[PDB]
Ligand binder design. Structure first.
Ligand SMILES: Nc1ncnc2c1ncn2[C@@H]1O[C@H](COP(=O)(O)OP(=O)(O)CP(=O)(O)O)[C@@H](O)[C@H]1O
Ligand SMILES: Nc1ncnc2c1ncn2[C@@H]1O[C@H](COP(=O)(O)OP(=O)(O)CP(=O)(O)O)[C@@H](O)[C@H]1O
Ligand SMILES: [Mg+2]
Ligand SMILES: [Mg+2]
Ligand SMILES: [Mg+2]
Ligand SMILES: [Mg+2]
Ligand SMILES: [Mg+2]
Ligand SMILES: [Mg+2]
Lengths: 304, 302
């Protein structure tokens, strides 16, 4: 035995901080990395999907391809940008069916057409399990990160919350038959759609923005932390879908818990004066930026 | 039922890439980097991967792996006529890996970025069983140079010397406690290859076809040849050999020519153009010619 500090002890964000300092980096910290180029800003970002962690080999491949692109396009949109070019690095087992990869890219192709971006390259390496690393390049006239929230700002989110988590739980049940609303939830988990419809809004009005990937509470703390402010959320303001309620009804669950802690919805979390609100978009006011520290819900403070 | 469906192993690496290209209806895929039109210039996107047990061992000096991680990708950018700008590094890391490993990896990354004048602006972290390193690089150029432009009559050049890296890998594999200075040089060339950043202008201005030598001379020359629909004739006696490589072969009874022909990971350059565009102030060596036909030949044989 020797005892040496391991990554596990440091923790995810502790490691990122170490990386940021070692690099003496000033840009690291947001969903994307803004770089100055031709009077505009290019946004560089990357996400990963590993077999056994974010999907199973039994998952429909085209959906996995759709998701791989969507997941990263989500970061770009959350920071006020439009996707442009992407590369996909694949770690593949030599026993995998050729049709799997082909179908994965069919899903990638459809997502790219939908988001109006393009996969221009990538890499292939041999491995035990499937690993998917996506690199995306986007552009914007105004980058919006996690540290620009202003006190008095209202806190917004897009769509509904908790759907993805319920979808995953339903998939885990491995039932041989699901009801329509259950398939809807499963589809939302398996095939999320990045809110590319919010780009202009974020780019023009948000003071602080990011996408909800790990859950509202957890991601709201990063926002509150980087903006050095306090976030007060009202549970009864959380946008809930009928399918989620139906799910929580059938399995004796509490919707609010799914809305606050459910991950992988890939909706947006942004802030700005309530007056900038756009009723044409499905945004919902759920709280506000108050001078202070931490994230509070109905008064009590909740940590990630 | 029975599964008779084709598996990746059967199809092969390049056959897979062709299928991927076809599926995306992509016109750009195929070269070391991907050129995209932007701001009256050409941005170059590219990605390489270093996986534990395959491209390196966890026992290798971390900072060297960090240096190489950046260097191998910058090499692709350089080989297609561009300069590196921004990079992202996605890491698959075992939760029980020493933090010192990661910090030292990034010290190597930092040093390479300062040397090549580019910057790591972000990345990703994921839990895994083994260390996985995926680097993404963005470069920029005024003139993109791919692998399909070789014109007949062109001379075939390479930079530096060849076979050094393979010699270095073999020395590493001997797991000796101490190496002679010349052996450390060889090891240095395998562990910490220096991308040919000094060739950017030359490649950008006068190369009709270019790429870096990573798989090996003959192996990569073959790609250059089929991509250009030309045949490449190389003369072994012209291959650039280093004193330390020759010293190595002398000591271990090896043939420096084989190393220069098949040795991988030197990350030197392979490009073609008229003999008159030769620049004596760069260490390029003419090793062959571009003629009509197909395939790669060495001293007459395929
Ligand atoms: N999963 C993937 N998706 C899309 N394109 C891919 C890909 N894997 C590889 N490619 C593309 O096919 C071509 C070859 O990439 P490859 O990684 O084999 O070579 P390389 O040019 O990086 C040289 P090296 O030996 O130096 O690594 C590139 O144009 C690349 O973008
Ligand atoms: N190995 C690495 N090297 C450099 N930067 C890294 C890194 N791993 C993560 N980062 C950076 O730290 C910040 C966080 O990345 P992270 O991948 O955890 O979040 P994310 O913003 O992509 C949200 P999500 O939950 O949606 O995936 C980013 O600015 C990222 O570029
Ligand atoms: Mg994000
Ligand atoms: Mg990420
Ligand atoms: Mg993300
Ligand atoms: Mg290359
Ligand atoms: Mg590559
Ligand atoms: Mg390469």
């Amino acid at each position: 035995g020797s005892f040496t500090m391991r990554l596990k002890e440091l923790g995810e964000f502790g490691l990122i901080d170490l990386i940021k300092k070692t690099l003496e980096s000033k840009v690291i910290g947001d969903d994307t990395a803004p770089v100055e180029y031709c009077s505009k800003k290019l946004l560089l970002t990357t996400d990963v999907l590993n077999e056994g962690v974010h999907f199973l080999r039994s998952y429909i491949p085209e959906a996995v391809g759709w998701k791989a692109i969507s997941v990263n396009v989500s970061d770009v949109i959350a920071n006020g940008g439009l996707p442009k070019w992407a590369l996909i690095s694949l770690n593949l087992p030599e026993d995998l069916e050729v049709s799997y990869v082909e179908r994965f890219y069919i899903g990638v192709k459809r997502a790219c057409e939908f988001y109006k971006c393009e996969v221009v390259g990538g890499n292939i390496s041999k491995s035990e399990k499937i690993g998917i690393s996506v690199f995306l390049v986007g552009e914007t006239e105004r980058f919006v990160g996690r540290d620009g929230a202003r006190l008095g700002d209202s806190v917004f989110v897009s769509g509904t919350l908790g759907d993805s988590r319920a979808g995953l739980e339903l998939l885990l049940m491995e039932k041989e038959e699901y009801e329509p609303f259950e398939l809807a939830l499963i589809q939302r988990h398996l095939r999320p759609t990045a809110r590319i419809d919010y780009v202009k809004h974020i780019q023009k009005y948000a003071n602080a923005s990011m996408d909800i990937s790990d859950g509202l509470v957890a991601d709201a703390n990063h926002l509150a932390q980087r903006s050095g402010v306090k976030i007060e959320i009202l549970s009864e303001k959380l946008p809930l879908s009928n399918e989620l309620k139906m799910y929580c009804e059938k399995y004796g669950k509490n919707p609010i818990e799914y809305a606050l802690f459910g991950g992988e919805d890939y909706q947006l979390l942004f802030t700005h004066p309530k007056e900038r609100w756009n009723p044409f978009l499905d945004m919902t006011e759920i709280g506000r930026v108050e001078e202070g520290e931490g994230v509070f819900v109905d008064g009590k403070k909740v940590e990630p």
